[PDB]
Design an enzyme around this catalytic site. Structure first.
Site, PDB file in Angstrom:
ATOM      1  N   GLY A  28       0.818  -1.195   0.000  1.00  0.00           N
ATOM      2  CA  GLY A  28       0.000   0.000   0.000  1.00  0.00           C
ATOM      3  C   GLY A  28       0.861   1.257   0.000  1.00  0.00           C
ATOM      4  CB  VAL A  33       2.693  -6.845   2.643  1.00  0.00           C
ATOM      5  CG1 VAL A  33       2.316  -8.170   3.293  1.00  0.00           C
ATOM      6  CG2 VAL A  33       2.014  -5.680   3.351  1.00  0.00           C
ATOM      7  N   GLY A 144      -2.969 -16.519   5.215  1.00  0.00           N
ATOM      8  CA  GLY A 144      -3.342 -17.282   4.038  1.00  0.00           C
ATOM      9  C   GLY A 144      -3.370 -16.387   2.809  1.00  0.00           C
ATOM     10  CG  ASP A 184     -10.040  -0.302   3.342  1.00  0.00           C
ATOM     11  OD1 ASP A 184     -10.747  -0.684   2.397  1.00  0.00           O
ATOM     12  OD2 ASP A 184      -9.025   0.404   3.213  1.00  0.00           O
ATOM     13  N   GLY A 188      -9.908  -8.121  -0.383  1.00  0.00           N
ATOM     14  CA  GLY A 188      -8.462  -8.241  -0.339  1.00  0.00           C
ATOM     15  C   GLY A 188      -7.925  -8.487   1.072  1.00  0.00           C
ATOM     16  CG  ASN A 189      -7.614  -5.673   3.604  1.00  0.00           C
ATOM     17  OD1 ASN A 189      -6.540  -5.956   3.079  1.00  0.00           O
ATOM     18  ND2 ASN A 189      -8.053  -4.431   3.714  1.00  0.00           N
ATOM     19  CE1 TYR A 223      -6.780  -6.273  11.175  1.00  0.00           C
ATOM     20  CE2 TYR A 223      -5.064  -6.316  12.839  1.00  0.00           C
ATOM     21  CZ  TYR A 223      -6.020  -6.973  12.085  1.00  0.00           C
ATOM     22  OH  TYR A 223      -6.182  -8.315  12.250  1.00  0.00           O
TER      23      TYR A 223
HETATM   24  C1  LIG Z   1       0.879  -7.983   7.275  1.00  0.00           C
HETATM   25  C2  LIG Z   1      -0.405  -7.363   7.726  1.00  0.00           C
HETATM   26  C3  LIG Z   1      -0.976  -7.592   8.942  1.00  0.00           C
HETATM   27  N1  LIG Z   1      -2.087  -6.848   9.025  1.00  0.00           N
HETATM   28  C4  LIG Z   1      -2.984  -6.736  10.162  1.00  0.00           C
HETATM   29  N2  LIG Z   1      -2.338  -6.115   7.911  1.00  0.00           N
HETATM   30  C5  LIG Z   1      -1.347  -6.398   7.075  1.00  0.00           C
HETATM   31  N3  LIG Z   1      -1.270  -5.936   5.789  1.00  0.00           N
HETATM   32  C6  LIG Z   1      -1.247  -6.708   4.618  1.00  0.00           C
HETATM   33  C7  LIG Z   1      -1.378  -6.115   3.351  1.00  0.00           C
HETATM   34  C8  LIG Z   1      -1.443  -6.939   2.243  1.00  0.00           C
HETATM   35  C9  LIG Z   1      -1.392  -8.316   2.438  1.00  0.00           C
HETATM   36  S1  LIG Z   1      -1.482  -9.569   1.242  1.00  0.00           S
HETATM   37  C10 LIG Z   1      -1.298 -10.780   2.443  1.00  0.00           C
HETATM   38  C11 LIG Z   1      -1.153 -10.289   3.704  1.00  0.00           C
HETATM   39  C12 LIG Z   1      -0.925 -11.109   4.826  1.00  0.00           C
HETATM   40  C13 LIG Z   1      -0.828 -10.827   6.216  1.00  0.00           C
HETATM   41  C14 LIG Z   1      -0.772 -12.017   6.946  1.00  0.00           C
HETATM   42  N4  LIG Z   1      -0.794 -13.212   6.225  1.00  0.00           N
HETATM   43  S2  LIG Z   1      -0.878 -12.798   4.558  1.00  0.00           S
HETATM   44  C15 LIG Z   1      -1.232  -8.831   3.731  1.00  0.00           C
HETATM   45  N5  LIG Z   1      -1.150  -8.037   4.810  1.00  0.00           N
END
Ligand SMILES: Cc1cn(C)nc1Nc1ccc2scc(-c3ccns3)c2n1
Ligand code: NI
Length: 332
Positions: A28, A33, A144, A184, A188-189, A223
């Site tokens: 982002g 990430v 995942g 949000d 995707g999340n 978050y």
């Molecule tokens: C690292 C993370 C942890 N939080 C609460 N928000 C995060 N932001 C993102 C953004 C894009 C993506 S695409 C796959 C993940 C994964 C996170 C955990 N397992 S996959 C991801 N995490």
């Protein structure tokens, strides 16, 4: 708050053999990430410039005081996994948080380049970072692969009830516990991880319950816009003066950003858990309109479940909270 006496080098968090397993999975404006392996154990890393007096991936560089909120939220949502009264795992657990210093590890630019090649990036290449550059590095359980990428891969509408159930249950508990808005929840999340487990477990305001898992373990992330309070102290991302979020569409997603502001009157301090119902409706839509199932709905019982979800979609905007959905709505 604190994990060390000062800033440390990248090699503290990403020793060589770890950096060599680093592989970008998402991004982002905040930054990047990556997935990797730590002691035979996958982990998502999140790297975020700080104290930088220059523009990064578009916006400015969040200060420490500005990034703290996200941490607090991430920690608080993680605690839920092992609480008693309000308990759920359907978030993602933080394993560590460290302030790192130095220019960007070349091995990681190799990973960033590969991502951008196969998938494309909306962020600038992070080669312009100095050796005095401070980052925050959040290390999480690996949840995942997100729902978008998992569309062809779901099995039946059964599986869709399970996920929606799981998400509601989670959001309810967070409402109950921390008075939490995610703000949000795009497909995707929402991560899915296979689980040999046959029933998941959670506790809301002291009551324990199960949810059939349908071979899947749903985890909530990002978050970045989320909100909560403990002891009347609110922790939230202010977007009142943001524009791009509410201006821009195509997908139904972008109407949610508008709808939330309509709900809360552009005051983002306040607690309006309808925000969670909205996002849940958006996801039910996605479940019905753009998912493709390994097993076809052509059996009386899978029809029945279909109907049961359509009725969910139409009815659900008339509940006040995930809590209320979970308790009151007749899907569950
Ligand atoms: C690292 C993370 C942890 N939080 C609460 N928000 C995060 N932001 C993102 C953004 C894009 C993506 S695409 C796959 C993940 C994964 C996170 C955990 N397992 S996959 C991801 N995490
Ligand atoms: Ni350490």
């Amino acid at each position: 708050e604190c994990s060390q006496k000062g800033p440390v080098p990248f090699s503290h968090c990403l020793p060589t053999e770890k950096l060599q397993r680093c592989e970008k999975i998402g991004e982002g404006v905040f930054g990047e990430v990556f997935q990797t392996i730590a002691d035979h154990t996958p982990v998502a890393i999140k790297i975020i410039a700080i104290e930088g007096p220059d523009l990064v991936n578009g916006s400015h560089q969040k200060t420490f005081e500005e990034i703290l909120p996200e941490i607090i939220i991430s920690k608080e949502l993680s605690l839920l996994s092992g609480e008693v009264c309000n308990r759920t795992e359907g978030f993602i657990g933080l394993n560590s948080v460290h302030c790192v210093q130095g220019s960007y590890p070349p091995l990681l630019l190799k990973a960033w380049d590969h991502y951008n090649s196969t998938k494309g990036s909306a962020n600038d290449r992070p080669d312009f970072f100095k050796d005095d550059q401070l980052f925050i590095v959040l290390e999480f359980e690996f949840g995942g692969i997100d729902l978008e990428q998992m569309r062809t891969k779901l099995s039946s509408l059964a599986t869709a009830k399970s996920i929606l159930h799981q998400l509601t249950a989670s959001l309810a508990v967070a409402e109950a516990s921390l008075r939490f808005e995610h703000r949000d929840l795009h497909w995707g999340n929402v991560l899915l991880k296979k689980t040999s487990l046959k029933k998941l477990h959670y506790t809301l305001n002291g009551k324990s319950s199960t949810i059939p898992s349908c071979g899947l373990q749903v985890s909530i992330i990002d978050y970045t816009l989320s909100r909560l309070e403990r002891d009347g102290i609110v922790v939230f991302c202010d977007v009142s003066m943001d524009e791009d979020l509410f201006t821009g569409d195509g997908d139904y997603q972008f109407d949610i950003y508008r709808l939330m502001k309509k709900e809360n009157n552009n005051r983002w301090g306040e607690y309006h858990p309808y925000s969670n119902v909205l996002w849940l409706h958006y996801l039910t839509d996605k479940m019905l309109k753009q998912m493709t199932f390994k097993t076809k709905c052509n059996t009386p019982a899978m029809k029945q479940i279909k109907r049961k979800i359509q009725e969910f979609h139409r009815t659900m905007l008339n509940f006040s909270s995930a809590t209320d959905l979970l308790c009151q709505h007749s899907l569950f």
